[PDB]
């Protein structure tokens, strides 16, 4: 039917960006598994390691140079937003009221 990969997350196909982006995605996939099954507050061991660790992927993504190609420029941003989405999940499950 339609063989046109248009998914912003997996659309990048060039040479440099394509690999770094695909790597982060696997990284985020592994990490998300831990997050999805995380239990504790923002002081727990796991929360701090998963966060910084999620932050290491954000940093990786930031070092990517799409060289202008639209598909990788968008795939990077989509991956960034994906990582922030996993971060948001970790924060929501650990957030506790102030007063």
């Amino acid at each position: 039917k339609e063989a046109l990969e248009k998914r912003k997350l997996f659309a990048c196909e060039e040479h440099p960006s394509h690999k770094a982006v695909w790597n982060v995605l696997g990284n985020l996939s592994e990490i998300q598994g831990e997050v999805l099954s995380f239990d504790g507050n923002r002081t727990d061991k796991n929360y701090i390691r998963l966060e910084e660790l999620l932050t290491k992927q954000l940093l990786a993504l930031d070092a990517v140079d799409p060289q202008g190609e639209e598909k990788c420029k968008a795939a990077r941003k989509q991956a960034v937003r994906l990582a922030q989405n996993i971060l948001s999940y970790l924060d929501l499950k650990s957030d506790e009221w102030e007063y």
Binding site: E51, E52, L58, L59, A63, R81
Partner: protein, 385 residues
């Protein structure tokens, strides 16, 4: 592998990072660690399951700031009653206690609590470097030359040596970092006789200037000056502060309270800074930096130099305090040597050069490794070359 083993290693036991090199097959090689890094952070972390040194320790810093020791060089050889120990005191997330006037870093290692003197933590760092070299050479290494700042005193130097002995090293000699730097560049192998050499060592957080007079194999320190807390970190902050403020003007929002957003901006700056040392312009782009808002901006080398005009400016004061102390006039300095990663900043070089009426700068040797290079050569000389 070989049948002509290396006789000794040279180690640059740095405040923030250490470096090791070895002279072999007629050449000196800086040795990379397990992660392929030419330099190893001078960090020692004590987890509840083990002890980490170098990169491993650095990496997990955020996870255990309370038991991740570093900067032990600032304490090594000093008395607990030492003033500086006090200033640097609480500035560290780890504990620094007293014991018969001998400082110690208090950390929680494997459930219980432990305390080590500075030379003990440095012996750990040195052990890593010792093993890094042995790993690459394919045999045991015991002989070494270790470098120390030229302003270090007998007690500080002896503790550094004690630190190497505790690590299984047979310390051939403790030499000055600037002497090692001068050796790397062969400033002592000219025939011109007496030479006045000035070493400009600007790192990430330490600034040292040294003037040595080299003559017939003698390296006499004529003066030492510097800024204890001035380095690359400071140029990073300006960039960081600059952009944060710029984000406000364009989005009326302050991100400084977002530790994740600043971390990304700071890392993007450190990269921009490095780019600015070779290109006149750097583009800073971070997707969805704050509240889904993208950040696509940029900056010129000139704009960058303005943001740190005063800091760069201060770079020359120690240079003049030193000339003053050595009773020398800028015109009497024969050689200039650049060490320290921050000396890669163009404006830093121009300022020093212009100051000495266009005298050439000895800087082609990686400024992060120069001292290690020189120590390695010195170690080889001491063993017979």
């Amino acid at each position: 592998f070989t049948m002509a083993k290396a006789a000794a290693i040279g180690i640059d036991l740095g405040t923030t990072y250490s470096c090791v090199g070895v002279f072999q097959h007629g050449k000196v090689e800086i040795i990379a660690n397990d992660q392929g890094n030419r330099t190893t952070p001078s960090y020692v972390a004590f987890t509840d399951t083990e002890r980490l040194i170098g990169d491993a320790a650095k990496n997990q810093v955020a996870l255990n700031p309370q038991n991740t020791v570093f900067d032990a060089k600032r304490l090594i050889g000093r008395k607990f009653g030492d003033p500086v120990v006090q200033s640097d005191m609480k500035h560290w997330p780890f504990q620094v206690i007293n014991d018969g006037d001998k400082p110690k870093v208090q950390v929680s290692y494997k459930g219980e609590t432990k305390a080590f003197y500075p030379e003990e933590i440095s012996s750990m760092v040195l052990t890593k470097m010792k093993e890094i070299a042995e790993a690459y050479l394919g045999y045991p290494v015991t002989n070494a030359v270790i470098t120390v700042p030229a302003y270090f005193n007998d007690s500080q130097r002896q503790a550094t040596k004690d630190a190497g002995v505790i690590a299984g090293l047979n310390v051939l000699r403790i030499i000055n970092e600037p002497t090692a730097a001068a050796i790397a560049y062969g400033l002592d192998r000219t025939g011109k006789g007496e030479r006045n050499v000035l070493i400009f060592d600007l790192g990430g957080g330490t600034f040292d200037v040294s003037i040595l007079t080299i003559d017939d194999g003698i390296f006499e320190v004529k003066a030492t000056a510097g800024d204890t807390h001035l380095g690359g970190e400071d140029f990073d902050n300006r960039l960081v502060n600059h952009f944060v403020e710029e984000f406000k003007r364009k989005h009326k929002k302050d991100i400084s309270q977002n530790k994740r957003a600043v971390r990304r901006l700071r890392t993007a700056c450190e990269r921009a800074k490095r780019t600015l040392s070779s290109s006149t312009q750097a583009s800073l782009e971070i997707d969805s930096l704050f509240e889904g808002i993208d950040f696509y901006t940029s900056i010129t080398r000139a704009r960058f130099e303005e943001l740190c005009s005063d800091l760069f400016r201060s770079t020359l004061e120690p240079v003049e305090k030193a000339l003053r102390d050595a009773k020398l006039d800028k015109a009497q300095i024969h050689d200039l040597v650049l060490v320290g990663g921050s000396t890669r900043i163009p404006k830093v070089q121009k300022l020093l050069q212009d100051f000495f009426n266009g005298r050439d700068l000895n800087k082609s040797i990686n400024p992060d490794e120069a001292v290690a290079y020189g120590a390695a050569v010195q170690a080889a000389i001491l063993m017979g070359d």
